[PDB]
Design a binder for this molecule. Sequence first.
Ligand SMILES: [Zn+2]
Ligand SMILES: [Zn+2]
Length: 471
Amino acid sequence: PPPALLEKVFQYIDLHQDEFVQTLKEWVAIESDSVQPVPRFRQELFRMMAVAADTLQRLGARVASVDMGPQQLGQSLPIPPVILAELGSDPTKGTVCFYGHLDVQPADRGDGWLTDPYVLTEVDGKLYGRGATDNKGPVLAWINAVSAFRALEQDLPVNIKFIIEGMEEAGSVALEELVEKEKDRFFSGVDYIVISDNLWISKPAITYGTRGNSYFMVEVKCRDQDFHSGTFGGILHEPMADLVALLGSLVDSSGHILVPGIYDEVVPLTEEEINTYKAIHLDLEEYRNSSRVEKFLFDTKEEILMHLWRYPSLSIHGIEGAFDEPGTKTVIPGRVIGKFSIRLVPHMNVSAVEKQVTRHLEDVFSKRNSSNKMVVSMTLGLHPWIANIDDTQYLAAKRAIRTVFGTEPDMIRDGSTIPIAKMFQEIVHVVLIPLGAVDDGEHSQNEKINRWNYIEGTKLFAAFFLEMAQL
Ligand SMILES: [Zn+2]
Ligand SMILES: [Zn+2]
């Protein structure tokens, strides 16, 4: 049983759930792809921001859609407006701000989707579609919670602010300058900030730490034109041969990173820290099963979680400029770019990591005595983020979770990076409430959010409004 007429709010959410799921279906069908520099998609992104601005206004919010200007690509594209919305300015009330994004990662059905990525399809309680979990589901769950108090003419316990952007999947272009401009304007008197764009691991969760990241591009160039692999086979220093040797020099079969210096500054594992991991709830057979992975690099819960949260990791993403379509093309690529990144943990320095990776790659390349040119560039470099657990925002969330799910949340870290979390910490001086399941498949084929997570998460947000008012 819930408290109060949270009972009535909860009743409302259960009765309007099919409507909440149809709104999500409608938002998902707007192909708000920010990553493709294609006018068709950027227009759909602007329409998305407009649909959201209208939704917030209809709820009762003062809404501003802030003109963001051009995105320099030697061409350019307009950036989608940022919604800056306020619902209530009651001086007898605290104020909570919610950040979300309504742009999505590209989705091509040919990538391996069993459904049309932009048609929300429910299969065994799972709602499949691009943006279902990342991030239209949790934005709507928050909005739908507010709309329950509004429909019932129930006083919202806190004032609510919304900051919603349309460029998160493309580096939040122009957000930081707007935030900076607004630090003592829109953010003046905002008590706590909420982000809901992350997943559980098993038991619901609250997330209080994230990894950093460093994204590397390694270009090996002969000439711009490719070669016929037979007509010119046998006589070139082939860009692909150099790149494959460069990429193959980075990590070993155990996951151990081979760049010298990389472990120098990782904080030492302590007894205390080990204990924190032992207290997390994770069935390793369950985790193997939802991931459909035969075996992981490690055998125990503690090793698995630590390698995700507090050890660095290296992933090779792909190669650009070579033969990557289906079939059997006989080509020596003239210019290729390897892509890989290293997730960063305390106490690693971004600038040192950049130096170390570069030096390593130069040393490998020079030993090849190749005629090719190599350019390493670190295109992205972010430090890790940690919240203070048992902050007032963090306690409200714990209580809200207990109310809705009837159990204590585990305090978890995250292997991914939430750059926005760091940005609000640096400029405005954040609580992460995950709604997604571990197997939601964000940034992949067959992304979903579970109906239960989406609907029960709406209730979580409702309870949370009330908890924030209570300190
Ligand atoms: Zn997201
Ligand atoms: Zn994303």
